Design a protein around this nucleic acid. Structure first.
Ligand SMILES: [Mg+2]
Ligand SMILES: [Mg+2]
Lengths: 244, 244
DNA sequence: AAAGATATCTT
DNA sequence: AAAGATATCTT
């Protein structure tokens, strides 16, 4: 499948390669920093050619947002079936010691899931799947060595700010949790679990429909959630009683 | 001085080098994406080496934040002058055409400038200068970036997502404006002017003390600002009224 | 303008 | 946890 091939390519590529810096056309190389803003950018750039390569093999068109505040990172679709689009979003997070619990922010809950055309490349209803390619890296302490420039002949000497990158591909709804992933930027939070749980998809929602409904009626502040629902249990009781 | 040296170094380096992709230890080069998040990250990484080079040359220790959401990008100081720290923050924005007005987001106005230690590496009072290194780049007309990899031989054939870059170093207060830079993330907005004005430092505040007082008393919503002040004029009128 | 999107972190 | 930081954009 497009899915199996994509995950095989990512898993494979992720083990045989290591990004160590940005290069100038003049051949000068600049080291990488240890914070997620940097690694997030790197993993996205890294994944681009792989996604494109695998998509092409299955006859899929790949499109990136034309504007900045638009989801998803990649929109795939065959010319003959425009209303069956696949959204692929790359998400990153870090861990301090391998095998700790991790969590991701899964996108806003007040944009395209509530308004079919808000901050999204194509109307939400034209997508049949929302895939998350999650990267987890163990953070490494920045040393003095990563504060100078390098030359092409020194590629092997440049220190990396990450240690053990792990990658997975999973449907957004499957890994979605019941607590917000951010306050003022109102993001959906993922389950807070170990990497294997994301790969295996041991989430809390029974269906994508339950996921959507939960997040479409989630109130922005605990104050507003006090009389409604603050988690999946309370949401199910709320549903049972008639949504009141 | 440290400041003049840093400014000279920034002009040269930037005038001599153009970043075109990220590179793996194995020599494989991945091209840059077009979205602002990418360039914001690249310019920050492009500057680290320069800042560290000039800092060492002047007896200054350079420190980056441990927590990822702490200001500033770089804290410079002599071990002998602990309470004479300099803060440097890197900001970027784009222009579609080389001579349009630009503006930057300059950091929050509700964190450390109101609460001396919130989200800052060292207490605000230990800093005696706050510089902003701003990069302005002109986007390219094409909305479609390259989706294949390149090798060291092809450096000259990799398309760049930007057409031209300008940089400047200036004190934060000198270029601060009176309108917020962001809403839910409560950022200070800078003046909305031409590149030349940021270089020359043609701001709106009469002093850093005014800049600080203005932003320490600015309200989050226009509803609350309407009974206080919404711009420099109204703020000055608010001072006359007795700050009520 | 002003408010709220885009991604992720911290306590 | 929930709320509010980190950059910067868009409408
Ligand atoms: Mg930084
Ligand atoms: Mg900064």
């Amino acid at each position: 499948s497009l899915r199996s091939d994509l995950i095989n390519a990512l898993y494979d590529e992720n083990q045989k390669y290591d990004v160590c810096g940005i290069i100038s056309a003049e051949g000068k190389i600049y080291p990488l920093g240890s914070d997620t803003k940097v690694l997030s950018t790197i993993f996205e750039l890294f994944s681009r050619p792989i996604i494109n390569k695998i998509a092409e093999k299955h006859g899929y068109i790949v499109e990136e947002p034309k504007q900045q505040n638009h989801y998803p990172d990649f929109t795939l679709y065959k010319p003959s079936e425009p209303n069956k689009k696949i959204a692929i979003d790359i998400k990153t997070t870090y861990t301090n010691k391998e095998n700790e619990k991790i969590k991701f922010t899964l996108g806003g809950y007040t944009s395209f899931i509530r308004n079919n055309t808000k901050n999204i490349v194509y109307p939400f209803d034209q997508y049949i799947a929302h895939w998350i390619i999650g990267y987890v890296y163990t953070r490494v302490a920045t040393r003095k060595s990563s504060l100078k420039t390098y030359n092409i002949n020194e590629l092997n000497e440049i220190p990396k700010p990450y240690k053990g990158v792990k990658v997975f591909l999973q449907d957004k709804w499957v890994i979605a949790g019941d607590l917000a992933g951010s306050g003022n930027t109102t993001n959906i939070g993922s389950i807070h679990a170990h990497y294997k749980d994301f790969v295996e998809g041991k989430g809390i929602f029974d269906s994508e429909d339950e996921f959507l409904d939960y997040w479409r009626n989630y109130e922005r502040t605990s104050q507003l959630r006090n009389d409604k629902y603050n988690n999946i249990s309370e949401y199910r009781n709320w549903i049972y009683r008639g949504r009141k």
